[PDB]
CSV table of N, CA, C and O in Angstrom, one decimal:
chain,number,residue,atom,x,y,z
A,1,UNK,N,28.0,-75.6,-26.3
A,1,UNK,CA,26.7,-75.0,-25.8
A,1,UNK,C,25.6,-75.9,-26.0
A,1,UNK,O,25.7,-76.7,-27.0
A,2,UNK,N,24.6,-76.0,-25.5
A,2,UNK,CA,23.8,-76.6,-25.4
A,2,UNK,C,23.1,-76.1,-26.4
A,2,UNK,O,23.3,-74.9,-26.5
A,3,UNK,N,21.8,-76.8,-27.4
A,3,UNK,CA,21.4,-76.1,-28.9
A,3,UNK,C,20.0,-75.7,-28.3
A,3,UNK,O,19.4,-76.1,-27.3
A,4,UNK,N,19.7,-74.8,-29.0
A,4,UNK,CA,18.1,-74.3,-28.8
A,4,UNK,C,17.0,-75.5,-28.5
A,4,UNK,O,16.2,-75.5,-27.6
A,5,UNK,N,17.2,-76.5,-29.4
A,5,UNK,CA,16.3,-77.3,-29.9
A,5,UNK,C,16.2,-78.3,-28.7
A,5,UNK,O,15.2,-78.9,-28.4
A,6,UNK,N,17.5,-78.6,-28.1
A,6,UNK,CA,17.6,-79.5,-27.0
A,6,UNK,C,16.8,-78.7,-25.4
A,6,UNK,O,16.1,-79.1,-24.5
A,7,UNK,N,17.3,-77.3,-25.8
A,7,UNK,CA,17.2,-76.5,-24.5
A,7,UNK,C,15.8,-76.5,-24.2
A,7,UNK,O,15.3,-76.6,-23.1
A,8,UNK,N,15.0,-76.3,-26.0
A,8,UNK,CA,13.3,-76.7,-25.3
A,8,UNK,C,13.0,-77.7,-25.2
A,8,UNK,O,12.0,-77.6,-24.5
A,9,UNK,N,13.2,-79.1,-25.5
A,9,UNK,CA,13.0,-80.6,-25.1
A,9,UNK,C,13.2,-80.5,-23.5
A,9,UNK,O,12.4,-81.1,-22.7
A,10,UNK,N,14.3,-79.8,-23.2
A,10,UNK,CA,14.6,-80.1,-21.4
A,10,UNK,C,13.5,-79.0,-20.7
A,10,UNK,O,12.8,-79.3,-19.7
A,11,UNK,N,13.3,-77.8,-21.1
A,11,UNK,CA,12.7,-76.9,-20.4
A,11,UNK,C,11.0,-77.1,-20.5
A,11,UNK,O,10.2,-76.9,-19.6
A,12,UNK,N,10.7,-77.5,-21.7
A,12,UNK,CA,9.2,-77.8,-22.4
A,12,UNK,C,8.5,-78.9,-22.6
A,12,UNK,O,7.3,-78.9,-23.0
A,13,UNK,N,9.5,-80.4,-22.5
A,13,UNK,CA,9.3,-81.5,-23.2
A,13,UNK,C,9.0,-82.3,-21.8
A,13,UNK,O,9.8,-82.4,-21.0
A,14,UNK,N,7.5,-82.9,-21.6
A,14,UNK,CA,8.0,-83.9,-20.6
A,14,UNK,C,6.4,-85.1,-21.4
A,14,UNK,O,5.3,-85.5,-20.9
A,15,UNK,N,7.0,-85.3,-22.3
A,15,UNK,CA,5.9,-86.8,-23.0
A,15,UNK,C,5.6,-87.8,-22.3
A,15,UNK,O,6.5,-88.6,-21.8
A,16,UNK,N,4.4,-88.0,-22.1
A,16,UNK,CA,3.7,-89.1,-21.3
A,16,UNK,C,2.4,-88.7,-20.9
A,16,UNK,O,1.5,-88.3,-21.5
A,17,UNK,N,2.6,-89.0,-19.7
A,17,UNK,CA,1.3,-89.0,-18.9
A,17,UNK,C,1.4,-87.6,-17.6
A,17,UNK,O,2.0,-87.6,-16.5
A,18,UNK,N,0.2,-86.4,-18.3
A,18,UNK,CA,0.2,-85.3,-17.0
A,18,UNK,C,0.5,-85.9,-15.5
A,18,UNK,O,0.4,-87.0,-15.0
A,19,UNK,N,0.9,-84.6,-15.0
A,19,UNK,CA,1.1,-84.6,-13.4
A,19,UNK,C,-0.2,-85.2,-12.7
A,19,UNK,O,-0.3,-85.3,-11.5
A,22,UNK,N,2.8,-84.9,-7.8
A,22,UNK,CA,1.4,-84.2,-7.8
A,22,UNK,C,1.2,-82.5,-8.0
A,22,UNK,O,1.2,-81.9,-9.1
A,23,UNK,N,1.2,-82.2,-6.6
A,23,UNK,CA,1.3,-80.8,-6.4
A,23,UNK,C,2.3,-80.2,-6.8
A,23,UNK,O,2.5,-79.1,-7.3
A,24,UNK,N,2.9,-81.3,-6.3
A,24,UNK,CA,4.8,-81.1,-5.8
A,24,UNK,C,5.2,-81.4,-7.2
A,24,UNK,O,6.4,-81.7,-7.0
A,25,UNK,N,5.0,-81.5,-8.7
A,25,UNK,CA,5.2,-81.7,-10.2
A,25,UNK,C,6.1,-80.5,-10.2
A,25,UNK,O,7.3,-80.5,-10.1
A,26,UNK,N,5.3,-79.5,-10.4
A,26,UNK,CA,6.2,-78.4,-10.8
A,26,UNK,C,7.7,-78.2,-9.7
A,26,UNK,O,8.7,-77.8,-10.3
A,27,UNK,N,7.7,-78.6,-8.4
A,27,UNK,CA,8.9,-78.2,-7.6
A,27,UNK,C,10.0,-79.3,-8.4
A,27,UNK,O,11.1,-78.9,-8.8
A,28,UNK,N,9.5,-80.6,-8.6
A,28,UNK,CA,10.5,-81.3,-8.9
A,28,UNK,C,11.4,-81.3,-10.9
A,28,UNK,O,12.5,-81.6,-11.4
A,29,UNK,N,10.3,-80.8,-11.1
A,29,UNK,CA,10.3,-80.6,-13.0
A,29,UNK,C,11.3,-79.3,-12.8
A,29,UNK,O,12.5,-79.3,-13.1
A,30,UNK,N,10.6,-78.1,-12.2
A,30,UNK,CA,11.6,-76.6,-12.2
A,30,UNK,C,12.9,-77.4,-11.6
A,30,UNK,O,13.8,-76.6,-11.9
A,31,UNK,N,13.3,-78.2,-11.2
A,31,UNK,CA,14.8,-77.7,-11.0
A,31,UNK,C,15.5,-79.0,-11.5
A,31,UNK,O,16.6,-78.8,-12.0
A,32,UNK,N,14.8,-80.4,-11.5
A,32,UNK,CA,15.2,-81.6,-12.1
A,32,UNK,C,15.4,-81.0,-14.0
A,32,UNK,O,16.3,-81.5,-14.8
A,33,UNK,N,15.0,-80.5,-14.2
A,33,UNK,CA,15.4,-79.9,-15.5
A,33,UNK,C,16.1,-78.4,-15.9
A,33,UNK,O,16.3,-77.8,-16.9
A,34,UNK,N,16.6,-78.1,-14.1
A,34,UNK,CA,17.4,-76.8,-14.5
A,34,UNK,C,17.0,-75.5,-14.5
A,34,UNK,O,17.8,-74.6,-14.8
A,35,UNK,N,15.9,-75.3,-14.3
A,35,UNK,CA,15.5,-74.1,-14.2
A,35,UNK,C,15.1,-73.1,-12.8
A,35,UNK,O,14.3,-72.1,-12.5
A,36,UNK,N,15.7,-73.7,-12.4
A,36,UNK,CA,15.6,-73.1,-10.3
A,36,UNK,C,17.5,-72.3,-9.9
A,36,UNK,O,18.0,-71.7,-8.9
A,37,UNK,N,18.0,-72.6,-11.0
A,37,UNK,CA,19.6,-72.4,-10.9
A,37,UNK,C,19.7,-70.7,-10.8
A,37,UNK,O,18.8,-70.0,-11.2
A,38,UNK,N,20.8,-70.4,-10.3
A,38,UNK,CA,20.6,-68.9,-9.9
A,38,UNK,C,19.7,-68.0,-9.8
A,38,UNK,O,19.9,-66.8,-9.5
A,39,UNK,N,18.7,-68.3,-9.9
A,39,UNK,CA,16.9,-67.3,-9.9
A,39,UNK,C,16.1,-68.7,-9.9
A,39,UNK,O,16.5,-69.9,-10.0
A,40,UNK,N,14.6,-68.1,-9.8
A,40,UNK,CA,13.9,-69.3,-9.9
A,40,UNK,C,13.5,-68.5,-11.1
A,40,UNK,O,13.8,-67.4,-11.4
A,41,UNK,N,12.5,-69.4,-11.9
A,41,UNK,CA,11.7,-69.7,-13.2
A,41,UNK,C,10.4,-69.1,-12.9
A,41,UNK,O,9.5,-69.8,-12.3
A,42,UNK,N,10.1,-68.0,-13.2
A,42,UNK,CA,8.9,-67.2,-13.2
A,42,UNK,C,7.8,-68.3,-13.4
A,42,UNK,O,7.0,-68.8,-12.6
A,43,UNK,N,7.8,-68.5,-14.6
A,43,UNK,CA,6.5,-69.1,-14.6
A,43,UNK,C,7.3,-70.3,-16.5
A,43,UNK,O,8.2,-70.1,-17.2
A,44,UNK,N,6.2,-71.6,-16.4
A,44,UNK,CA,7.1,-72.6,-17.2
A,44,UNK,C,6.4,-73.6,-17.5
A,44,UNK,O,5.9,-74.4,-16.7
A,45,UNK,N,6.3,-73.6,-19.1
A,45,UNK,CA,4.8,-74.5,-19.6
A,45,UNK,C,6.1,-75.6,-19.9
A,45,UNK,O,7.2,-75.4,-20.4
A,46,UNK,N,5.4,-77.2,-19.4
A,46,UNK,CA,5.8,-78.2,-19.9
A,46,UNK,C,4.3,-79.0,-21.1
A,46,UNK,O,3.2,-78.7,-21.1
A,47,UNK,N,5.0,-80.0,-22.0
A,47,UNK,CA,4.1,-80.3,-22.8
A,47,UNK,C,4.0,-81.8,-22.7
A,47,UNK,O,5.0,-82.5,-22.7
A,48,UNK,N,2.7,-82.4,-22.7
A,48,UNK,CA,3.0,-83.8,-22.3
A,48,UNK,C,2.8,-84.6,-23.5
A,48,UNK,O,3.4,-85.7,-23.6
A,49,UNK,N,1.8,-84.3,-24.4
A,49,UNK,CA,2.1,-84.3,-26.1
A,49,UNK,C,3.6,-85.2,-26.5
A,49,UNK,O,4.7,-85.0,-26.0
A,50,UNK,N,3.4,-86.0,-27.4
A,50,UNK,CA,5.0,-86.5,-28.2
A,50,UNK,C,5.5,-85.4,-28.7
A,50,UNK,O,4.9,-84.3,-28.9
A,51,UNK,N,6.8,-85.8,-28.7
A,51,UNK,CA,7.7,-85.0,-29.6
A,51,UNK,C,7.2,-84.8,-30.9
A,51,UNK,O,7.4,-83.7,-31.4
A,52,UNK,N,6.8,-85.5,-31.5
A,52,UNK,CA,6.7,-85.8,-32.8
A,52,UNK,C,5.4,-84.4,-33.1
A,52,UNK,O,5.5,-83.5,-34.0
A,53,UNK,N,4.3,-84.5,-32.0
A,53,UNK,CA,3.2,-83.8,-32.1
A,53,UNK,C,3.6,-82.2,-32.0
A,53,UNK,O,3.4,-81.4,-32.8
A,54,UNK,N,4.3,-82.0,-30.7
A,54,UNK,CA,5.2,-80.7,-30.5
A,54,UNK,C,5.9,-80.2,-31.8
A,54,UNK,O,5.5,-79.1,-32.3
A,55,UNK,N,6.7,-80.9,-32.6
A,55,UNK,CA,7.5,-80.6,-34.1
A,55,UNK,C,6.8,-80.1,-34.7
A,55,UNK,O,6.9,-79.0,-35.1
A,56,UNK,N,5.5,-81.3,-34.9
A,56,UNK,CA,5.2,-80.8,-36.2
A,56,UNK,C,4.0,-79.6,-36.4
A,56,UNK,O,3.4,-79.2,-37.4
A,57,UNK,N,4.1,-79.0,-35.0
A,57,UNK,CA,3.7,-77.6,-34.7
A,57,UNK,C,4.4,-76.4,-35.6
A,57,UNK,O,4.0,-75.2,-36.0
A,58,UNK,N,5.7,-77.1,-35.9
A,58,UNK,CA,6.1,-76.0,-37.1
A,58,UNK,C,5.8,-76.0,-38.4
A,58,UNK,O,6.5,-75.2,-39.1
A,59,UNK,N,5.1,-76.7,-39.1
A,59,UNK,CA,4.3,-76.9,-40.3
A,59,UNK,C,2.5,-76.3,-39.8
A,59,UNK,O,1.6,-76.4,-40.6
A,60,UNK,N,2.1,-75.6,-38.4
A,60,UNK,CA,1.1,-75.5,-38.8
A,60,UNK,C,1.1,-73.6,-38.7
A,60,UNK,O,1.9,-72.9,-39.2
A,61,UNK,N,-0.3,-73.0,-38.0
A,61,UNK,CA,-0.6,-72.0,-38.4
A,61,UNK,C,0.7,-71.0,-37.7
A,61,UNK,O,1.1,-71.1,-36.5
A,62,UNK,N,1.1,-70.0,-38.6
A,62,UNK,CA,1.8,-69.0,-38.1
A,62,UNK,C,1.5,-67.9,-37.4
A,62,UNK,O,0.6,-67.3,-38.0
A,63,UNK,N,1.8,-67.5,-36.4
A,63,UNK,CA,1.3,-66.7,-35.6
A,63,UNK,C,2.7,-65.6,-35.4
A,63,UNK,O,3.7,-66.0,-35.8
A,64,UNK,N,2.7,-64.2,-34.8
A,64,UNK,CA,4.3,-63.5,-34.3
A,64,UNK,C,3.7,-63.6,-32.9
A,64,UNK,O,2.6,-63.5,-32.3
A,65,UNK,N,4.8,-63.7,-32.6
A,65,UNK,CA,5.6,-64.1,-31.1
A,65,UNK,C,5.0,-63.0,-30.4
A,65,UNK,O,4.5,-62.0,-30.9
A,66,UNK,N,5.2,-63.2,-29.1
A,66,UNK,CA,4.7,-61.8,-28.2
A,66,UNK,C,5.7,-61.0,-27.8
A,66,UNK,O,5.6,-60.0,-27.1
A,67,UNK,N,6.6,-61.5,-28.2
A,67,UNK,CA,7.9,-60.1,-28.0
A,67,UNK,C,8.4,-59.9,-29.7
A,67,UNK,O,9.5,-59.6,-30.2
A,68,UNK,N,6.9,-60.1,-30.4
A,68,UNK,CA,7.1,-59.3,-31.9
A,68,UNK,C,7.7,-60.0,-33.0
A,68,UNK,O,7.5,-59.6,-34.2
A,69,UNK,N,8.5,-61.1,-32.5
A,69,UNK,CA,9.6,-62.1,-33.8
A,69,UNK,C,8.3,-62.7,-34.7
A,69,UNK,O,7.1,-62.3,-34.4
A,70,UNK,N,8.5,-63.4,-35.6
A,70,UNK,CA,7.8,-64.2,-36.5
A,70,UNK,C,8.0,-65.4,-36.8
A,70,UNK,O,7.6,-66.0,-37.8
A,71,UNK,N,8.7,-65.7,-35.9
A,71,UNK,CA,8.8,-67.6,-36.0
A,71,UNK,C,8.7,-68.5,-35.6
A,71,UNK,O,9.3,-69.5,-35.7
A,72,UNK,N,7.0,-67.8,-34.7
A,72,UNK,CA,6.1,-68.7,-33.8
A,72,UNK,C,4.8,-69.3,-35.1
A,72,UNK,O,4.4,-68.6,-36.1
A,73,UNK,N,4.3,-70.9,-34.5
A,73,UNK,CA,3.5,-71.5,-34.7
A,73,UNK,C,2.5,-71.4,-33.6
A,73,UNK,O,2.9,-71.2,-32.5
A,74,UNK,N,1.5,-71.6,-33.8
A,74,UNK,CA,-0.1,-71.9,-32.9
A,74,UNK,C,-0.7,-73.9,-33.4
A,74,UNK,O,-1.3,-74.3,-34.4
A,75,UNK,N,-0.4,-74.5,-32.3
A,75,UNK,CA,-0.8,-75.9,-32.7
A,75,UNK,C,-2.2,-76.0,-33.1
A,75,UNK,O,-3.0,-75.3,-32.4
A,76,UNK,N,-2.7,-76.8,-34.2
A,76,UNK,CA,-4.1,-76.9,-34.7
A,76,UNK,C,-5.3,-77.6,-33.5
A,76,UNK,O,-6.5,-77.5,-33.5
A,77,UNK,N,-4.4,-78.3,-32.7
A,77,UNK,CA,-4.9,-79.0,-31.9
A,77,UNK,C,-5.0,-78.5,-30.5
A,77,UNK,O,-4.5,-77.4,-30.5
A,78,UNK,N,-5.4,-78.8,-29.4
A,78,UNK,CA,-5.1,-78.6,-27.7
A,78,UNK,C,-4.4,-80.2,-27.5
A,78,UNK,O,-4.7,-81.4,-27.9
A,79,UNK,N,-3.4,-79.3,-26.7
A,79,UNK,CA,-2.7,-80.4,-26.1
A,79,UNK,C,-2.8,-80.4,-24.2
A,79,UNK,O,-3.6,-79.6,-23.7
A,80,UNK,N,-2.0,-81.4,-23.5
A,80,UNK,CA,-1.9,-81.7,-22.5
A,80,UNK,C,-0.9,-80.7,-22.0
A,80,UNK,O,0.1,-80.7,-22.8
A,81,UNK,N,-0.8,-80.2,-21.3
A,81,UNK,CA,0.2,-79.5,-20.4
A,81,UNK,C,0.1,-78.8,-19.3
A,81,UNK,O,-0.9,-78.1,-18.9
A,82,UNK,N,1.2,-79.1,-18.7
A,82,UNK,CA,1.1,-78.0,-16.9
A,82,UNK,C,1.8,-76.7,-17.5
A,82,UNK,O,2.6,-76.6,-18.4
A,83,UNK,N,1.1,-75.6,-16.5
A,83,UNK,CA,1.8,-74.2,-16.3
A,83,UNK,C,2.2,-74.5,-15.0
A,83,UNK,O,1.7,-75.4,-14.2
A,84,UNK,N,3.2,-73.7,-14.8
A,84,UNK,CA,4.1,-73.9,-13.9
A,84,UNK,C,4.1,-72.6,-13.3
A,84,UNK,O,3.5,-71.7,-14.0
A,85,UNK,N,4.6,-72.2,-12.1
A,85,UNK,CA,4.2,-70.4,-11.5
A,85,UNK,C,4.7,-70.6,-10.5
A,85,UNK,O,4.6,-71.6,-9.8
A,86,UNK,N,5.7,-69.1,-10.0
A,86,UNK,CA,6.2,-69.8,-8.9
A,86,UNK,C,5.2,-69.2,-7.7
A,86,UNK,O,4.6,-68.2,-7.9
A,87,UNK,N,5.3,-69.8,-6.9
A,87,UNK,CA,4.3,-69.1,-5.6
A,87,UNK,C,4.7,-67.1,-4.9
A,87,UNK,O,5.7,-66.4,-5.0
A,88,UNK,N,3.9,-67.1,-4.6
A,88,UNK,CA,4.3,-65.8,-3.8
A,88,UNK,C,5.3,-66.0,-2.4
A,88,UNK,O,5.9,-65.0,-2.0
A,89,UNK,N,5.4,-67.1,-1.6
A,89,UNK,CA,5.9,-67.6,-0.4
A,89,UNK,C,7.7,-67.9,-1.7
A,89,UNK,O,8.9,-67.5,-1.5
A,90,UNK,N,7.5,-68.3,-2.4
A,90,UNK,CA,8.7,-68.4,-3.2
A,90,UNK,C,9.8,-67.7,-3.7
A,90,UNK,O,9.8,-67.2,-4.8
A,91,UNK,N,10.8,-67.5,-2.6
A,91,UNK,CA,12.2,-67.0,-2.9
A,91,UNK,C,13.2,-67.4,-2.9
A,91,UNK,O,13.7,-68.0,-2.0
A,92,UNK,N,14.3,-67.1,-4.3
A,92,UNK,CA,15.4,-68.2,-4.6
A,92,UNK,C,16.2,-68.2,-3.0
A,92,UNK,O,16.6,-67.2,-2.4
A,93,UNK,N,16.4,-69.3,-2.6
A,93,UNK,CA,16.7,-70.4,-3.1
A,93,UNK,C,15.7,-71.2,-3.2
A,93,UNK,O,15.5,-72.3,-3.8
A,94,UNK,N,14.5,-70.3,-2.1
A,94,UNK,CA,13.1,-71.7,-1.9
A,94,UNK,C,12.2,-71.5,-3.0
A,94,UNK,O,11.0,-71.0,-2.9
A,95,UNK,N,12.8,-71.9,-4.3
A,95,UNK,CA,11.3,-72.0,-5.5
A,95,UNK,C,10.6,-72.7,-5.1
A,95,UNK,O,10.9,-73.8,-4.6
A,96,UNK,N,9.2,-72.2,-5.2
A,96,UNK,CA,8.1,-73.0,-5.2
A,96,UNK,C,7.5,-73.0,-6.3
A,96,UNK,O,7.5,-72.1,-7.2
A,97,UNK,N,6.8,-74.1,-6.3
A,97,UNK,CA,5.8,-73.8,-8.0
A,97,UNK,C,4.4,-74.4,-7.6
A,97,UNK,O,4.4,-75.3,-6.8
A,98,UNK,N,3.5,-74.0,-8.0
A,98,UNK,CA,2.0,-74.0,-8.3
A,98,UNK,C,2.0,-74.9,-10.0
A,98,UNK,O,2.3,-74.3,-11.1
A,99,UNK,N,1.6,-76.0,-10.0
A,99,UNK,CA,1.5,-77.1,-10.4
A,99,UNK,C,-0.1,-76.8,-11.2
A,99,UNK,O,-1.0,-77.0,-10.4
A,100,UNK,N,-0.6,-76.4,-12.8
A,100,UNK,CA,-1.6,-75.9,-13.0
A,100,UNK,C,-2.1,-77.1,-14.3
A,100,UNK,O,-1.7,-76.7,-15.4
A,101,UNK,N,-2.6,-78.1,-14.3
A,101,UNK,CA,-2.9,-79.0,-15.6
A,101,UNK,C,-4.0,-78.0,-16.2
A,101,UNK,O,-4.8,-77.3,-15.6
A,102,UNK,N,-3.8,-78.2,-17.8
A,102,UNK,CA,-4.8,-77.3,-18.8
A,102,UNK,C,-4.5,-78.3,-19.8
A,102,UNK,O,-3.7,-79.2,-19.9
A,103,UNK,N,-5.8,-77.6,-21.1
A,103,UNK,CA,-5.6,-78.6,-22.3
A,103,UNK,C,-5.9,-77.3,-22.9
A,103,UNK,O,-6.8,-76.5,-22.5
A,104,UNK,N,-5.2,-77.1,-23.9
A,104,UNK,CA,-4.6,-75.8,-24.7
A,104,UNK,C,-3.8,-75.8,-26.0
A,104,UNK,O,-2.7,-76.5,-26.0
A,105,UNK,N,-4.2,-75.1,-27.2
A,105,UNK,CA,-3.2,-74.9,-28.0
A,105,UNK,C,-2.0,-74.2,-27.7
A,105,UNK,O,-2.0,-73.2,-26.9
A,106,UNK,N,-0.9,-74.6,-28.3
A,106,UNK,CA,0.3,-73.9,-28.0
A,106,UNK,C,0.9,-73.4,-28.8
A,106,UNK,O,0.8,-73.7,-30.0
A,107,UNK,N,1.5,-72.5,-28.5
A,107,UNK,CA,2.4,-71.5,-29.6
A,107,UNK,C,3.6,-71.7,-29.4
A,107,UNK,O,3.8,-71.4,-28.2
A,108,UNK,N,5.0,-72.3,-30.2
A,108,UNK,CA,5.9,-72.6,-30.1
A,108,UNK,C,6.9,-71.7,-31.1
A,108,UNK,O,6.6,-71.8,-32.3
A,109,UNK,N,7.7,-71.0,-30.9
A,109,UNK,CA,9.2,-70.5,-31.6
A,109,UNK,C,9.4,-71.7,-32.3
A,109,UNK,O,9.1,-72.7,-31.7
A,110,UNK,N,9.7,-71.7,-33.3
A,110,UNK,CA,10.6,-72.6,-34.8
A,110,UNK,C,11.4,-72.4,-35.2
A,110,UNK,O,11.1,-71.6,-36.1
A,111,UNK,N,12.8,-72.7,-35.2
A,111,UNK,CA,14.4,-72.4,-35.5
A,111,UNK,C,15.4,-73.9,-36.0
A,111,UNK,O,15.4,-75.1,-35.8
A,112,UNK,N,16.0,-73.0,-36.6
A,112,UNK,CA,17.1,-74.3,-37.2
A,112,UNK,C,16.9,-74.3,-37.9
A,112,UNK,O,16.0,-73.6,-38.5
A,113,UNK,N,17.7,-75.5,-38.5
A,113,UNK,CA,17.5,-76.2,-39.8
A,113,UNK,C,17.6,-77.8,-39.4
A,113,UNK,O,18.7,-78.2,-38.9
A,114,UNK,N,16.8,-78.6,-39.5
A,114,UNK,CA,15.5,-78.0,-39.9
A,114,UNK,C,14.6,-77.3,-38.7
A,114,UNK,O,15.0,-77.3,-37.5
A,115,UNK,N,13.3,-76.7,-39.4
A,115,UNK,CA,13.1,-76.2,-37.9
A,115,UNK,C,12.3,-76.9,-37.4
A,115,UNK,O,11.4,-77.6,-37.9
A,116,UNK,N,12.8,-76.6,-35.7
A,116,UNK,CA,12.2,-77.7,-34.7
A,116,UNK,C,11.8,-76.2,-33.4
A,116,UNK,O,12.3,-75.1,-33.3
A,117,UNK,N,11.0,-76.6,-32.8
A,117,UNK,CA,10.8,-75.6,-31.4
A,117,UNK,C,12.2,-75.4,-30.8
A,117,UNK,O,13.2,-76.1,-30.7
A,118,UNK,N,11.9,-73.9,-30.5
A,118,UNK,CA,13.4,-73.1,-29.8
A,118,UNK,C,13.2,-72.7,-28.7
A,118,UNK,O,14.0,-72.5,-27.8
A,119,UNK,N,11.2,-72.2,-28.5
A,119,UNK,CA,11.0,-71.2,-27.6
A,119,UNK,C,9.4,-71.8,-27.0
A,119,UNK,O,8.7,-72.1,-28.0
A,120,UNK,N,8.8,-72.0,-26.0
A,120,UNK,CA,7.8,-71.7,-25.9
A,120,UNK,C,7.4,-70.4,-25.7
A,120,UNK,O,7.9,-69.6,-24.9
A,121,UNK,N,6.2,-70.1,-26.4
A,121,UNK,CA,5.7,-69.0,-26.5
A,121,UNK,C,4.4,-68.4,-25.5
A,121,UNK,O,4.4,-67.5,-24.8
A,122,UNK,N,3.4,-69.3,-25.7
A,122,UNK,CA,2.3,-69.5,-25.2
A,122,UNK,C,0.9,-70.1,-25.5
A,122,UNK,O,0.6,-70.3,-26.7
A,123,UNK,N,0.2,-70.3,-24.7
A,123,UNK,CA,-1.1,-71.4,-25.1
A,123,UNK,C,-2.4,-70.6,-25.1
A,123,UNK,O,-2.8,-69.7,-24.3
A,124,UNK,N,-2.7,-71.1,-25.8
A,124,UNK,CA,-4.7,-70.2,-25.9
A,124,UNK,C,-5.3,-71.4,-26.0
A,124,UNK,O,-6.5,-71.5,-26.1
């Protein structure tokens, strides 16, 4: 199976340099998430890895479906929201391509722990 920790590097991780329009069509499915349904809606983070991690040493925040093993990053980071259009039905995902600079709230699991879940950005 594929591990939590990889599953958010592929679904959440895209380091470098922000998104064109067409970002989100090619990210939603070049990373898997257009497969049987499309992907409601899907934050990528353009932040290092290193910066994403060490989101789990900072403030603790609970999760919006109530768990407790979300962090809130001290910083705003770079990232697209992702959404899929209203014209958008599987098989035809579309996505609306949204750049923001935002703190993130990330799930923390494992050992050690590393991001499992994105949560959400304020």
């Amino acid at each position: 199976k594929e591990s939590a920790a990889a599953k958010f590097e592929r679904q959440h991780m895209d380091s470098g340099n922000s998104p064109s329009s067409n970002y989100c069509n090619l990210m939603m499915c070049c990373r898997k998430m257009t497969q049987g349904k499309c992907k409601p809606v899907n934050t990528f983070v353009h932040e290092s890895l290193a910066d994403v991690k060490a989101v789990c040493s900072q403030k603790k925040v609970t999760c919006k479906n109530g768990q407790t093993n979300c962090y809130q990053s001290k910083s705003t980071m770079r990232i697209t929201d992702c959404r899929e259009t209203g014209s958008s039905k599987y098989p035809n995902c579309a996505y609306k391509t949204t750049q923001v600079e935002k703190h993130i709230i990330v799930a923390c699991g494992g050992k050690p722990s590393v991001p499992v879940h994105f949560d959400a950005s304020v």
